[PDB]
Design a binder for this molecule. Structure first.
Ligand SMILES: O=C(O)Cc1cc(O)ccc1O
Ligand SMILES: O=C(O)Cc1cc(O)ccc1O
Ligand SMILES: O=C(O)Cc1cc(O)ccc1O
Ligand SMILES: O=C(O)Cc1cc(O)ccc1O
Ligand SMILES: [Fe+3]
Ligand SMILES: [Fe+3]
Ligand SMILES: [Fe+3]
Ligand SMILES: [Fe+3]
Lengths: 426, 425, 425, 425
């Protein structure tokens, strides 16, 4: 049923009725089908064209037709930041709550660059839901990157419907209205809420003009509108708060649209993974799928990086990640299988945080196997881990620090590292 | 009053002949026994196009002052309002009965940050009923002033300028000035720019002429005062008023040269660019002045106007399109009526449409425009404007409790009908 | 003929279902037994916004060809003309009698450099009376086509597009095509771009919409030929036509994806921006496409048009102002009449005003515009354009020797009167 | 021989203790009575990342020389060849019988410009059968040397380095050196860079390690000659050899410090990056050194290698894709065989595929690569490379008439079969 349009960054055009898009202009005095033209400006008007995101919508009712928004009683993001804590942290998977919880009600704040009330940089959540949304929602605080881990989602957006399963990702532009339906009854996955410059493909450098995530594989849904008359709740997230009003129509009433500010999805199984074909262990920036820049050239707001099935051929090399201390902040999760660097304790749905200059690296067991291994071409398979790497430090929420799922002795995973130093034998 | 023209020029003005040193900035014995002082409006190391600095030749160094002390009267110390995503509209602000000079009468409307940590832009509406009997400088930012009622006579260190409704003036951060109310009372708007100084927009395809022409930006000529007697010196620092008493007038600059200057501009001289075919151009096209960030293309704020202009778009919906925006749109009105809003938006009024809030023409403007007979139409007798900021503008507590805040703004859109017919393109 | 819309898109098109490999570019065994081939329009390492590259899935690789040999017929061999700083105007070019297909009919008009050392821009007028019975590619640059008389049907590697006067078309460097004349004969203008590929201008204050809207740029859908038999393949290299003989059609691309594409654009769809107040905006404001240099702001060439448009400027001299320009202004005319010239400038004609040559409205146009009663006037039924280049344009020997070159173009300004009266402001 | 390590370092080396002035560059009385001399490899005002300058402390200043005089023997005086778009391949070059030292033996293969107006890049193959009994510098550009047969002992102003096949060496413009042939004869390739100095490529997502690691670039330590006796000093200027005679050694630098240095690099140390999944990455991914232009992303030339490497791409056509390129591809071979060409391409040989020429794997390689059953495979015992330039490479007349030019290179692609079946995905 669902068709998609391909090509990251494209000026797309889609209409659900023939000729619904005005021809040769954006704002006819009398629009086709008696629709209303509406502009969704995702960026300042004066961005360089390469950075412009904006979409013209031709819709049954203007978005401006809504009564006063009011603050909902139920607020999942109102918990305070946790205390200062430099420790290396790891969480076991999050259980799905018993009480009714839809997609937006189910975000568990893990760690963020700032407090919810003054969004900046990145905010990280784990979502757990057991109901489809019976309302429509937009996020005024940022762009959303969704990384499903358990259960498929059907995401009905203003520009059309997309379905996403684990091993795929989805991105929803700031301000865009959507409704998240659960195809498998319940769902769990990771969210990076990006409050800065929109995610986009990394500069490829010497990799050139193809590879990593190829832009042909980024898919955007085709136009689709609803005509359901009767009360519909519109919720927006603003400064961390859920506010709502009630409409008497469906706000997913866009019959046609054209432009570049679009929801999209991507299948990580399609990543054109580049790595070493010789020796050593490349910097994990080499696995970058999407990135959000800052005004500081080369220092991202965040990089979305993956660790996929891949060939390991490095000769005479310590193949797992090197022991590491980073200016950046490293938040990892796991979609399936096991991650190469950690023998036990890092499960799908789990998470780790190694903040600025925290000493990390492969655990004792992994290290021991790696040095002893007899090296031949080896394909890592049946796994997908990822990282949200942020320039700003990630402060864990109080909820996360108080989480029963917060493992108590993560530090022990390094505790048995032996000295093997012998100044007498090079 | 005489003026020097040319936005961004290296000016030179002297109130006494030869008062400027010739061929250097720092003579050992300066003409007329004046003191050389440097006002660095930017870091020393800015590229030359970004540099703002003025050399002052003055009777007493600004360094001659006793300790500043916090004033009890603090117009800008009120809290920030609570979180509120709603579309907001305010009726004109009445002028207070209590004695209130220019600096005492800034009503905080909305700001990117709390007054104690200035960042981005702070927006105010000023109301005053007294001329200033003292001198003031703002350590927190550059001031953009947009008079709505009443003329201002502004005595600055670099000289005197007068501004009336339909003109704007800008006072650089740290520059001392004193505001006289020529008409007894005054009301207008203020954008306080805590970021990169306002400048002319990059014209892109518009090229090398158009919009605000640089020849129209006017700076006053040198004028000094020789009052001996106690003068209060007030500064705004991190939101607070602090003061000391001097025994001389700090407006004692006999000559100056450089680029860091106060200036004025008559909005009636704007070379308005628009469509000459069809459709409705983005309102960035009406940009008068802009403050950039380190992110190319994304301003700290754009100052944009909606002036008398020709509407000629054919087969077009001529009023603004329905819109949702990353940026934050604060609109004011200097005179007349604005084309997007039939009623409720008056001179001295304000509207705030925050990031991604759904806005556009009201139901009435909509009906009329679709049924209108398209033909060249001169919009006249109006002047609206917008301060557009990239950071969200947080309404102050005062603005949210304001009797002038309209209770039923959302109702102006309430009667928009569905006209959809799936069976008729 | 179907098209794909959106300037600069990563497009994907297949003439057979699933002819595009899914999830990769280079399968070991490609669908349908096709061959993968990459056309790199730019260096691999360009920033993504500047990247132009298309993947092709074709019956035979382009590498399957015998040695190229120089043809005896060389339309572009003529030398550069002598040095001449004068203002030049040519009448329309007659179509020659002898058989002349599209590539045989380019009359070199003016160019930044000799044809054997391509640089900047080379300008031609094409005259043809035969469809091509061969396939062609230009190794020297991107081709901007501006038809003036006659429809073209252009069969490219990526598919077929048809172009008529008032439309333009661009064929990327190195891409193979064949031109069929739908009307028996054809005439038009060519800008051959040896520099950075043409693209949409930065809009500055115009914002995110306007001028040439990206949705209006159309790219053909995949289309392949299967005619076996002998086919001549010609390439232009350093000004010369070289050819080889193939035993298959080189237009055998069954599927493709990417961003290095031919496209067309309808100039009637141009969202024309201009003055809605007074004065006369810089003609850069009419920019459709632009080729930049490494010097920001200074294009290799701007392609600018002068379309139907409302003139409403008040108390203004509305025709172009008198002008001297660093840049070099080559004008053509697709239909109608141009606003700055009253006689002598006809469809298919050309004018050249080089670096610092004094140009402006002719005496007749000037006289009328000063005397006119001013009111809203719609310029209609006309399309002029300009190729504006930063490097000087050297007229060819053929152009300087042309019978179509007018002998007394200077005379059109000869009657400009003084009207200066120092006693009457 | 000892070396200092780290591409782009501020190095410091002295052959006598304390010969480098401490804490300054220009003492009034320098240690040991030496002369200070600055070698400015770049403009003074380059950003520091781009700066190359070396301070020398030497026995006599370089200014002590008689007038230079044009040599009668001119190795590079032959003209450019005619225009020729064809794909070209040459067999290895024989070494001439006549006495020919390093600089006498450069055979021009292809260049962006005629020797008299150096621009971009010039490519040569050197053949020599004598060591130099004289000293040489190149005013026209930086030299990248790629030995293929025979070892070199290169005495430079900054010290002595030894280079063998599989290593490269770079000598900065203007620096003096003398080449000794350790094996009696030598043959190899040269890229003469007339533009921005070669440097490490921006790594992009590869990040902060990989490709050529900076620690592996080695520079010789100070070494001076005290001999008095006749020495000929030759320079290449605008393509011509000019010489004067000294009665002392110009390799008399006792101490030096700075960043403008000769260096060498072992290609066997290249941290090769490639696909660990599928497809065939752009060969830019093999970049060792690059020379930029003012156009970001578009190199003057990239130096790229094809080294021993693991081939794991699954369900993939593993050899280079068929290709047409804006850029110009000159390939060479140091040892073994290159993956894309079954026969005809030997160590010492060369290919040129110019802008938009159709290239790709030969029919033999292609056929085999489609049929092979894929498994992990280490390509080994090979080293090829490419000089890829943005400007077109014109082959010299010498190279076009060279007996070693292969008469039927096009034949290698002539047996490419159609395998298209439109009725079978
Ligand atoms: O495994 C980790 O925790 C992250 C990581 C991955 C990698 O490839 C190199 C370094 C590193 O810290
Ligand atoms: O009228 C408004 O509120 C502001 C506005 C002006 C305009 O020209 C286009 C869009 C827009 O929201
Ligand atoms: O008429 C011309 O020749 C071209 C031209 C057009 C314009 O709008 C302003 C100046 C100019 O030279
Ligand atoms: O083999 C060649 O001629 C050079 C080459 C190498 C490569 O990896 C991809 C394309 C290409 O043309
Ligand atoms: Fe790390
Ligand atoms: Fe708006
Ligand atoms: Fe002109
Ligand atoms: Fe190639």
């Amino acid at each position: 049923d669902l068709h998609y349009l391909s090509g990251f960054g494209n000026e797309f055009a889609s209409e659900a009725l023939p000729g619904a898009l005005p021809v040769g202009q954006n704002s006819p005095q009398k629009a086709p089908y008696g629709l209303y033209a509406e502009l969704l400006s995702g960026t300042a008007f004066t961005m360089a064209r390469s950075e412009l995101r904006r979409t013209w919508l031709y819709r049954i009712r203007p978005s401006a037709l809504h009564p006063r928004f009011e603050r909902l009683a139920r607020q999942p993001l109102g918990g305070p930041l946790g205390g200062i804590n430099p420790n290396r942290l790891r969480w076991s998977p999050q259980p799905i709550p018993a009480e009714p919880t839809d997609f937006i009600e189910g975000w568990l704040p893990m760690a963020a660059n700032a407090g919810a009330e003054k969004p900046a940089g990145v905010s990280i959540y784990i979502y757990r839901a057991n109901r489809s949304m019976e309302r429509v929602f937009f996020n005024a605080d940022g762009e959303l990157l969704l990384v499903p881990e358990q259960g498929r989602l059907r995401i009905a957006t203003e520009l059309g419907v997309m379905e996403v399963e684990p091993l795929e990702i989805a991105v929803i532009p700031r301000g865009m209205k959507f409704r998240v339906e659960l195809l498998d009854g319940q769902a769990r996955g990771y969210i990076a809420e990006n409050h800065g410059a929109p995610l986009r493909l990394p500069d490829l450098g010497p990799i050139g003009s193809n590879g990593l995530a190829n832009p042909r594989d980024f898919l955007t849904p085709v136009a689709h509108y609803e005509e359901a008359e009767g009360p519909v709740q519109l919720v927006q997230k603003f400064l961390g708060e859920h506010w709502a009003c009630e409409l008497q129509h469906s706000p997913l009433d866009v019959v046609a649209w054209h432009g570049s500010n679009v929801p999209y999805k991507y299948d990580l199984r399609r990543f054109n993974t580049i790595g070493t074909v010789s020796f050593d262990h490349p910097d994990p920036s080499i696995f970058t799928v999407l990135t959000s820049p800052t005004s500081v050239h080369g220092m991202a707001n965040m990089d979305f990086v993956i660790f996929p099935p891949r060939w390991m051929v490095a000769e005479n090399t310590f193949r797992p990640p090197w022991f590491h201390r980073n200016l950046m902040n490293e938040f990892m999760g796991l979609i399936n299988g096991a991650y190469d660097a950690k023998a036990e304790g890092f499960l799908p749905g789990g998470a780790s945080l190694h903040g600025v200059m925290s000493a990390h690296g492969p655990d004792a067991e992994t290290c021991e196997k790696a040095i002893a291994a007899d090296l031949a071409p080896h394909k890592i398979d049946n796994t997908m881990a990822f990282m949200f790497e942020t320039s700003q430090v990630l402060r864990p929420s109080l909820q996360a620090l108080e989480c029963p799922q917060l493992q108590a002795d993560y530090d022990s995973c390094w505790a048995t590292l032996p000295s093997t130093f012998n100044p007498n034998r090079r």
